[PDB]
Write a structure and sequence with these properties.
Keywords: ATP-binding, Chaperone, Cytoplasm, Nucleotide-binding, Stress response. By secondary structure, this protein is an alpha+beta fold. The chain contains 6 helices and 8 strands, in the order E-H-H-E-E-H-H-H-E-E-E-E-H-E.
Length: 213
C-alpha cells in the first residue's frame, strides 16, 4: 500500500550557501525585483522551447500553449509561478540551476554587504536565488521532454533535495512555489503583484495570467 520514493540530497556550493545566508538575513528594500528575475527565467525557458519547436514541432506535443501563470494562494501563503516552457532536466537542475556560482561571486557577496542591492548581483545569473528574498522555502518542479519530471526543494541551509516527481504531471515546463515569509504576505494580493509585473515585466513577449482566489 505504501509507496516509498527515492530521494537524493545534495549540497549547495560554498559561495551559493553563503549567498543564501546573506540574502535571507540581510534587509533589502527593492526586493520586489524577485518577480522580474523569475519571470525572466520562465520567459527564457519559453524562448528555448520556442526555438526548439522551429526545428522540432514534436516538442509542442507536450503542450502548444506558451505562457506564464501566477497562482497566489492566500491559505497556503505561497506564490506559485508556472510556465509551459522548455523545462529542464535533472542534469540542468544540479549543474546549471541550483549550483550557479563561479570565481568572482566573492566580490558580489561583499558588495551586498557593502550596501549593494539584489538587482545588481542578479545580473551574475544568480537571479534565481532571489526567491529567498520573499520566500523562506522554495520548491521547483520541472520536466523536459528528454527526461522525467523532477521535484526540487530546499530551505537553504546549504543543502537541497531532488527526486523524480510522482505528483501531478505537468507535461512540459516549470513550476516554482515560493513559501513566502510572514512579513512578505503582501505579495499574495493581485494589487501588489500586478503593480510589480506591469512596472518591471510589461515588455514580455509571452502572455501572463494571474489566478486570484
Amino acid at each position: 500500500p505504501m509507496e516509498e520514493e527515492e530521494v537524493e540530497t545534495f549540497a549547495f556550493q560554498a559561495e551559493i550557501a553563503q549567498l543564501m545566508s546573506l540574502i535571507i538575513n540581510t534587509f533589502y528594500s527593492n526586493k520586489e525585483i524577485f518577480l522580474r528575475e523569475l519571470i525572466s527565467n520562465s520567459s527564457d525557458a519559453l524562448d528555448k522551447i520556442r526555438y526548439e519547436t522551429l526545428t522540432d514541432p514534436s516538442k509542442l506535443d507536450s503542450g502548444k500553449e506558451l505562457h506564464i501563470n501566477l497562482i497566489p494562494n492566500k491559505q497556503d501563503r505561497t506564490l506559485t509561478i508556472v510556465d509551459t516552457g522548455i523545462g529542464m532536466t535533472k542534469a540542468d537542475l544540479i549543474n546549471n540551476l541550483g549550483t550557479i556560482a563561479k570565481s568572482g561571486t566573492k566580490a558580489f557577496m561583499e558588495a551586498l554587504q557593502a550596501g549593494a542591492d539584489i538587482s545588481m548581483i542578479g545580473q551574475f545569473g544568480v537571479g534565481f536565488y532571489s526567491a529567498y528574498l520573499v520566500a523562506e522555502k522554495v520548491t521547483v518542479i520541472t520536466k523536459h521532454n528528454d527526461d522525467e519530471q523532477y521535484a526540487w526543494e530546499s530551505s537553504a541551509g546549504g543543502s537541497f533535495t531532488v527526486r523524480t516527481d510522482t505528483g501531478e504531471p505537468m507535461g512540459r515546463g516549470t513550476k516554482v512555489i515560493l513559501h513566502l515569509k510572514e512579513d512578505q504576505t503582501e505579495y499574495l494580493e493581485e494589487r501588489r503583484i500586478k503593480e510589480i509585473v506591469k512596472k518591471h515585466s510589461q515588455f514580455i513577449g509571452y502572455p501572463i495570467t494571474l489566478f486570484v482566489e
